[PDB]
Design a protein around this ligand. Structure first.
Ligand code: CHL
Ligand code: CHL
Ligand code: CHL
Ligand code: CHL
Ligand code: CLA
Ligand code: CLA
Ligand SMILES: CCCCCCCCCCCCCCCCCC(=O)OC[C@H](CO[C@@H]1O[C@H](CO)[C@H](O)[C@H](O)[C@H]1O)OC(=O)CCCCCCCCCCCCCCCCC
Ligand SMILES: CCCCCCCCCCCCCCCCCC(=O)OC[C@H](CO)OC(=O)CCCCCCCCCCCCCCCCC
Ligand SMILES: CC1=C[C@H](O)CC(C)(C)[C@H]1/C=C/C(C)=C/C=C/C(C)=C/C=C/C=C(C)/C=C/C=C(C)/C=C/C1=C(C)C[C@H](O)CC1(C)C
Ligand SMILES: CC1=C[C@H](O)CC(C)(C)[C@H]1/C=C/C(C)=C/C=C/C(C)=C/C=C/C=C(C)/C=C/C=C(C)/C=C/C1=C(C)C[C@H](O)CC1(C)C
Ligand SMILES: CC1=C[C@H](O)CC(C)(C)[C@H]1/C=C/C(C)=C/C=C/C(C)=C/C=C/C=C(C)/C=C/C=C(C)/C=C/C1=C(C)C[C@H](O)CC1(C)C
Lengths: 221, 35, 242, 222, 222, 44, 100
């Protein structure tokens, strides 16, 4: 179960026989899905898994940030500049500006250049510290992928027997978040509407209103 | 008269194909002598 | 490769069935580049006179190549649309007689108005050409900085071979191998003979037709029967034979 | 013509040079064409080889399925308005007539895209799971990439030399078909017509009906 | 010095925050700033072939980056020298104009009209050049595939070893800068529809709003 | 018109075909004979 | 040509391979026979393109179909349609079509 040769795999019984020999299952989130063979060398497998984990956490942030303003605008009644996620960047160009809760007393930003500059400098320092794994005494230790100290204030990083279990949970729902955010990206281009907006239009009539109705919009002319 | 033309065209094409591929099929080698 | 142009079994100016192998003069034994055994008149005399005339032939060959390029290219540019002002070769000197000056077209960023007058051009040409022709006989050159060798001194032309000085005159190398060097020597002398024939043709065609060789070739390709030696020698036309 | 061994034909001819060391010509279609270098590891090479062969076979099927119906419509088969051209064939199901096979109303006549997609998902998922596992009910253990058996009923692959030559034929036909399939994909979005229609338009006057007629189509506009 | 960009304590892609350099990325090759986050150059043969095609891309990008802006830099006040084809992404249509593709606007230079013939000449010449590059030809057969330097470098320079290495990293850094510039040229052409030099002039006219954020809403799926 | 004719004579029809079925049966017959000859060449 | 033919018939080389391998040939050398065939095919192609050049640029060829009773007509835009040319080569040889 999720570890060892009797672990869960990406094709069930169909993945029983043909499994790559370097997919041992020691590493979390192992379902044996390397049918394209990009990770034969375990150093590039380590690299690919750290990019995979960083993308999983980033898409967890993304998927929680796509749904929250639009769900608050429709199912909670609060007003925003735009609850549409792919139109939420241009609201800083409006006369009112960008408000955190629709109120001009919160954030109220009007300088896209200044907010880009502060975002670049803060995240450059943060990502350079993450890639370096700390230096000069402070945080000059750990495994630079699952740090723990100064990043786990709730104390859940201990008890390794269940720590690996919710690590597998983290990778699984991070993969779900990456899939959901890819769905958000594709739905933005095709439908041109917000995700839970398309969900609400789907609940009105699932027979007609689906992805196949808009499948004819990209035909060449 | 169209199906008559189809039948005749098929017959002529068949016999011409037999001619061409039979002469392609190692025709100089069918000799009693050497070579 | 090399046997086709050197040795007893080489390409002669007449084939084997039209010229016997012992009919070649004894001083042409396939040791020089471009040896075709072509000497019907008693001008070669002996091997040392042949070697002495080889210098004249090679200098005239290189000058004829530079010539043929200098006649064909600017006239073609002038006829095709470049602002040359004197691209035709037998009249390019008349554009500087009183106060005019030739525009230089250095492709592709061409069209530049040169400000040197005829007197200054002639003086600098005589000075530079006398200097280089005196350096050629003496084999001495003061300065350096050629791409063949970085900043060569003056004591490098001494000990070299005249009429074929390697080193500073060979920036691209590709001549240290003796076999390809000999093959390229044959290529050079054949191209030079072709250029000599071409420039004599340019002069004779200019005297006959009154126009440049580029105009000659363009009008001939436009109408070969309507423009050739037969047409230009005839005049205007003839009464039709009915 | 000696497609194997060290003296096999290469991807560039006499100007190719020395092929990579791991490309020994053992496998079919080995011309040494690995100028990126995504087959240094033998395991990655095997995975990319089976990926390439699966792509090849799917592309043979796809290329034939693109070419056939437009020729049939041009040859009298009543494909109504847009079922002739492949990138509108999927649009046939949202009408009232549905997918009428060969223009016959009582042939197929399908309108539930959800149900046909569903049955395709279960059927093809079972097929790919059996293929990936290498074991199926009634099928013993054998070569996953080149099974034969029930997949080669004629059994004309028994001879080893003929099998190797036919393997080279299969991979070269596959590469040609998948080159043609990417040609169809690019040609559809650029021109907007079928491949046979593009061939017919090109054969009318190849001087102007070429790929350079649509070179100015996708130019950006301020 | 050389130890600043070849030793173990060389400058990297993160400055003082780059202690996690991969172990196979030591400092033997030009450039080599430790930027291998993806880890896909782990195989030494793959890394070598990547570096070869990277330097090929670098030289091509240097030529392209210097060549896209040269006609726009030489463009006059109104455009007798170059018509609509002064811009790089619409320069190809210069072959289709009535006069023809002149080099600097005059009929005496180039003046080509057959795009098919010039593409055939390009294909033949470039195929011969690439075959000679990967195999060897009139220039040299057993030379270094990345740094031949006997016929393409006749001006000395690459004779002193430390100087050759220093100009090598100069070459790879200028090539990477030109690649970044060429990618910027492509993306600017996609979103603005104007030349890079005129984009620079509009940005210098008023940098408060003439930025990429002026075109951030262009690709909004309405 | 009192009678029906194909009227395919003249007009420079390629190989004399006036319908696509004639070209198709010609190509099919040639392909069948070629396939038999190819798979049965060299006396097997 | 008569001088050349008489020369090779009388005092020319008897056989060509021992002295001129480019012109020497045996009847069983299929590569050499195809080389000679290719040389002659290139020559014939140049000969046909000579008439093409005359009709297109040298202001020749007499069109009997020109209005007024024919005239020497320089030909502009010849019909190079492959379907048209192959249609002439595959049409019937009888009265309605006339083949070629
Ligand atoms: C390899 C499979 C595959 C491909 C390439 C396509 C392609 C297409 N389908 Mg489609 N389908 C495919 C499978 C299936 N379709 C359907 C059901 C439908 C319907 C119901 C409709 C389409 C339509 C369309 C077209 C949309 C117009 C467009 O974007 O044109 C421009 C794009 C192209 C010309 C080519 C784009 C693809 C090319 C770049 C391939 C790239 C690689 C692949 C994406 C790899 C992944 C493939 C996987 C997901 C199967 C389009 C050409 C619609 C249509 O015809 O509208 C007029 C439509 O109504 N499809 C089913 C369920 C039975 C499929 C099952 O496998
Ligand atoms: C001290 C801190 C320091 C930091 C934080 C960085 C950071 C960086 N260096 Mg760097 N360096 C630093 C010091 C130094 N560097 C160098 C020398 C170099 C070189 C030579 C190179 C770098 C490069 C890089 C970059 C590599 C990663 C990347 O491309 O990410 C991607 C960046 C991001 C994800 C940032 C976020 C961007 C986002 C906010 C922009 C907007 C996004 C869009 C709106 C989305 C649109 C989506 C759709 C709609 C299209 C990166 C931003 C490389 C590079 O890429 O150069 C250009 C490189 O080649 N550095 C030296 C000299 C020794 C340094 C000395 O201190
Ligand atoms: C790296 C080479 C290369 C590139 C980038 C281009 C790009 C372009 N050419 Mg082009 N060409 C190139 C080579 C050649 N062209 C021509 C002949 C012509 C003609 C005759 C015309 C063009 C035109 C065009 C433009 C079409 C409009 C457009 O938005 O297109 C799409 C552009 C983009 C989406 C921008 C991003 C480009 C990026 C995708 C390309 C780089 C990656 C590629 C996938 C690499 C492909 C393989 C390589 C080998 C080319 C375009 C910018 C037309 C034009 O200017 O119309 C106004 C036109 O009429 N080209 C020849 C033959 C001599 C080439 C030979 O190599
Ligand atoms: C070295 C060979 C050489 C040859 C073959 C000619 C040939 C000719 N030049 Mg000439 N020139 C040559 C060298 C030189 N010319 C001139 C300066 C002139 C002038 C100024 C003129 C000629 C003219 C002429 C022509 C009539 C005399 C023509 C036949 C005349 C001309 O073009 O008449 C139409 C004319 O006016 N030449 C200079 C000094 C720069 C030369 C220096 O080497
Ligand atoms: C600024 C970019 C740049 C730099 C720094 C270098 C540097 C170097 N190159 Mg390189 N090269 C470049 C671009 C560059 N190259 C481009 C774009 C191409 C494709 C044409 C090449 C193709 C190339 C080959 C084939 C070879 C080299 C070699 C070398 C090495 C020694 C010879 C040399 O050129 O010294 C540099 C000397 C200079 C004076 C710098 C050049 C400055 C130029 C001349 C300014 C003018 C640019 C001009 C307007 C562009 C027109 C293009 C046209 C000339 C083709 C050296 C480390 C040789 C080698 O590998 O060594 C063994 C070698 O074999 N290069
Ligand atoms: C079918 C034509 C033909 C062919 C294949 C040959 C072949 C040969 N001839 Mg020969 N010859 C020919 C016609 C031909 N000749 C004619 C018409 C003449 C009369 C001028 C001669 C006179 C001739 C002599 C005197 C000798 C040869 C010799 C030779 C042999 C040596 C190689 C050589 O080319 O010598 C050289 C031949 C020439 C340089 C003739 C000039 C050819 C120029 C380059 C014209 C190029 C042709 C061009 C496409 C135009 C075609 C005509 C056009 C109007 C249709 C060789 C096997 C030699 C020999 O027999 O060895 C013992 C030799 O002594 N030939
Ligand atoms: C020996 C000497 C040969 C000397 C000269 C040869 C002359 C011409 C050579 C053939 C020129 C025509 C080319 C083919 C034209 C054609 O197929 O038209 C096809 C014609 C025309 O067909 C008719 O066309 C009409 C419109 O013009 C109408 O449509 C008619 O309905 C249609 O039947 O039909 C034929 O004549 C086919 C006859 C086939 C005979 C095959 C004999 C094969 C013998 C041996 C195998 C050889 C290989
Ligand atoms: C109306 C249009 C008028 C114009 C069209 C006219 C088309 C004429 C094309 C004939 C040219 C083929 C030359 C082969 C001659 C014999 C070669 C051989 O000795 O061949 C033998 C050789 C032995 O080595 O083998 C080989 O090299 C194989 C090479 C032969 C190529 C095979 C042909 C393609 C096969 C397609 C089959 C058609 C299948 C049936 C279609 C059914 C449709 C309903
Ligand atoms: C495994 C395997 C194996 C085989 O064999 C091979 C292969 C195929 C390779 C494979 C697979 C793979 C895959 C699946 C991939 C995918 C991925 C993804 C999708 C990602 C995403 C990923 C994603 C991501 C990151 C995302 C992110 C997001 C974000 C940030 C967002 C943000 C935001 C928000 C909040 C909101 C607002 O309003 C806007 C913004 C601001 C914008
Ligand atoms: C080798 C190498 C090496 C070097 O070094 C580097 C590199 C460059 C990387 C390389 C190369 C690569 C390549 C070339 C690739 C390509 C690919 C492809 C083309 C694919 C396609 C592929 C393609 C494919 C599959 C296709 C398929 C198709 C299909 C299915 C179709 C289908 C269909 C049909 C029937 C019809 C209808 O109506 C519609 C549909 C339904 C739609
Ligand atoms: C390192 C690393 C590590 C990690 O870990 C991972 C990863 C991410 C993979 C990485 C990174 C990478 C990158 C950054 C990449 C990029 C690249 C590029 C940009 C290229 C370009 C590249 C670019 C290029 C070549 C370009 C080229 C250009 C050209 C030819 C041009 C041409 C032209 C000209 C002159 C002008 C005219 O009028 C037009 C034309 C004709 C068009």
């Amino acid at each position: 179960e999720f570890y060892g040769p009797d672990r869960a795999k990406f094709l069930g019984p169909f993945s029983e026989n043909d499994t790559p020999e370097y997919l041992t299952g020691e590493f979390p989130g192992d379902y044996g899905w390397d049918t394209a063979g990009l990770s034969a060398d375990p150093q590039t497998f380590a690299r690919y898994r750290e990019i995979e984990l960083i993308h999983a956490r980033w898409a967890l942030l993304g998927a929680l940030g796509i749904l929250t303003p639009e769900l608050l605008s429709q199912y909670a009644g609060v007003q925003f500049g735009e609850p549409v996620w792919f139109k939420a960047g241009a609201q800083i160009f409006a006369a009112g500006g960008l408000n955190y809760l629709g109120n001009e007393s919160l954030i109220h930003a009007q300088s896209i250049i200044a907010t880009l500059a502060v975002q670049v400098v803060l995240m450059g320092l943060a990502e350079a510290y993450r890639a370096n794994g700390g230096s000069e005494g402070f945080l000059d230790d750990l495994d630079t992928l699952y740090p723990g100290g100064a990043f786990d204030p709730l104390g859940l990083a201990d008890d390794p027997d269940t720590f690996a279990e919710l690590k597998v949970k983290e990778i699984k729902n991070g993969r779900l978040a990456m899939f959901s955010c890819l769905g958000f990206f594709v739905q933005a281009i095709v439908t041109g509407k917000g995700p839970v907006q398309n969900l609400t239009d789907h609940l009105a009539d699932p027979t007609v209103n689906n992805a196949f109705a808009s499948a004819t919009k990209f035909t060449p002319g | 008269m169209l199906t008559l033309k189809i039948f005749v065209y098929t017959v002529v094409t068949f016999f011409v194909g037999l001619f061409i591929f039979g002469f392609l099929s190692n025709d100089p080698s069918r000799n009693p002598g050497k070579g | 490769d090399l046997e086709k142009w050197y040795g007893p079994d080489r390409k002669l100016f007449l084939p084997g069935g039209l010229l016997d192998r012992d009919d070649v003069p004894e001083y042409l034994n396939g040791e020089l580049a471009g040896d075709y055994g072509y000497d019907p008149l008693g001008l070669g005399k002996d091997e040392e006179q042949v070697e002495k005339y080889r210098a004249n032939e090679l200098l005239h060959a290189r000058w004829a190549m530079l010539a043929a390029a200098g006649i064909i290219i600017p006239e073609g540019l002038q006829a095709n649309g470049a602002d040359i002002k004197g691209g035709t070769w037998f009249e390019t000197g008349a554009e500087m007689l009183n106060g005019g000056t030739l525009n230089y077209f250095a492709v592709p960023f061409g069209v530049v108005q040169n400000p040197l007058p005829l007197a200054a051009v002639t003086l600098i040409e005589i000075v530079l050409l006398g200097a280089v022709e005196k350096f050629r006989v003496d084999g001495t050159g003061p300065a350096g900085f050629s791409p063949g060798v970085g900043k060569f001194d003056s004591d490098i032309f001494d000990g070299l071979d005249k009429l074929y000085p390697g080193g500073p005159f060979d920036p691209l190398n590709l001549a240290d191998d003796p076999e390809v060097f000999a093959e390229l020597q044959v290529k050079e002398i054949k191209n030079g003979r072709l250029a000599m024939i071409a420039v004599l043709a340019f002069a004779i065609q200019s005297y006959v037709t009154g126009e440049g060789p580029y105009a000659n070739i363009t009008k001939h390709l436009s109408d070969p029967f309507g423009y050739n030696l037969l047409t230009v020698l005839q005049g205007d036309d003839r009464v039709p034979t009915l | 013509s000696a497609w194997y061994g060290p003296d096999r034909p290469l991807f560039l001819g006499s100007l190719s040079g020395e092929p990579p060391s791991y490309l020994t010509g053992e496998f079919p279609g080995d011309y040494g064409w690995d100028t990126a270098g995504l087959s240094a590891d033998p395991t990655t090479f095997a995975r990319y080889r089976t990926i390439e062969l699966i792509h090849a076979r799917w592309a043979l099927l796809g290329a034939l399925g693109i070419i056939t119906p437009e020729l049939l419509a041009k040859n009298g088969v009543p494909f109504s308005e847009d079922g002739a051209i492949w990138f509108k064939a999927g649009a046939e199901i949202f009408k009232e007539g549905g997918l009428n096979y060969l223009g016959n109303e009582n042939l197929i006549h399908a309108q539930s895209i959800l149900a046909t997609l569903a049955v395709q998902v279960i059927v093809m998922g079972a097929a790919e799971g059996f293929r990936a596992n290498g074991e199926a009910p009634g099928v013993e253990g054998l070569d996953p990439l080149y099974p034969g058996g029930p997949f080669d009923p004629l059994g004309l692959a028994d001879d080893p030399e003929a099998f190797a030559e036919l393997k080279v034929k299969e991979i070269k036909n596959g590469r040609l078909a998948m080159f043609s399939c990417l040609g169809f994909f690019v040609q559809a979005i650029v021109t907007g017509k079928g491949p046979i229609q593009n061939l017919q338009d090109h054969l009318a006057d190849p001087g102007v009906n070429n790929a350079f007629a649509s070179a100015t189509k996708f130019v950006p506009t301020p | 010095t050389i130890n600043q960009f070849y030793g173990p304590d060389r400058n990297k892609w993160l400055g003082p925050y780059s202690t996690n350099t991969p172990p196979y990325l030591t400092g033997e090759f030009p450039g080599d700033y430790g930027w291998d986050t993806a880890g896909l150059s782990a195989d030494p043969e793959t890394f070598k072939r990547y570096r070869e095609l990277e330097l090929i891309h670098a030289r091509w990008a240097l030529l392209g980056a210097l060549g896209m802006v040269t006609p726009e830099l030489l463009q006059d006040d109104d455009g007798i020298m170059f018509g609509e084809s002064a811009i790089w992404f619409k320069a190809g249509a210069a072959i289709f104009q009535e006069g023809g593709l002149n080099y600097l606007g005059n009929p005496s230079l180039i003046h080509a009209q057959n795009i098919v013939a010039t593409l055939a000449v390009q294909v033949v010449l470039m195929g011969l050049v690439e075959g000679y590059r990967v195999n060897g030809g009139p220039a040299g057969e057993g030379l270094d595939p990345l740094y031949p330097g006997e016929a393409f470098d006749p001006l000395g320079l690459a004779d002193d070893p430390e100087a050759f290495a220093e100009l090598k990293v100069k070459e790879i850094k200028n090539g990477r800068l030109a690649m970044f510039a060429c990618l910027g040229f492509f993306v600017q052409a996609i979103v603005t529809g104007k030349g890079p030099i005129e984009n620079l002039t509009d940005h210098l006219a008023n940098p408060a709003e003439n930025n990429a954020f002026a075109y951030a809403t262009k690709f909004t799926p309405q | 018109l009192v009678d029906d004719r194909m009227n395919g004579d003249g007009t420079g029809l390629p190989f004399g075909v006036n319908d696509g079925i004639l070209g198709w049966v010609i190509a099919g017959t040639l392909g069948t004979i070629w396939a038999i000859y190819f798979v049965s060449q060299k006396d097997l | 040509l008569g001088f050349g033919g008489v020369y090779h018939s009388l005092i020319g080389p008897e056989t060509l391979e021992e002295s001129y391998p480019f012109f020497g040939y045996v009847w069983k050398d299929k590569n050499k026979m195809t080389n000679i065939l290719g040389y002659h095919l290139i020559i014939l192609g140049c000969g046909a393109w000579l008439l093409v050049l005359k009709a297109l640029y040298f202001g020749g060829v007499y069109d009997t179909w020109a209005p007024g009773g024919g005239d020497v007509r320089i030909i502009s835009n010849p019909t190079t349609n492959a379907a048209i040319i192959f249609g002439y080569i595959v049409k019937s040889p009888f009265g309605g079509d006339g083949w070629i």
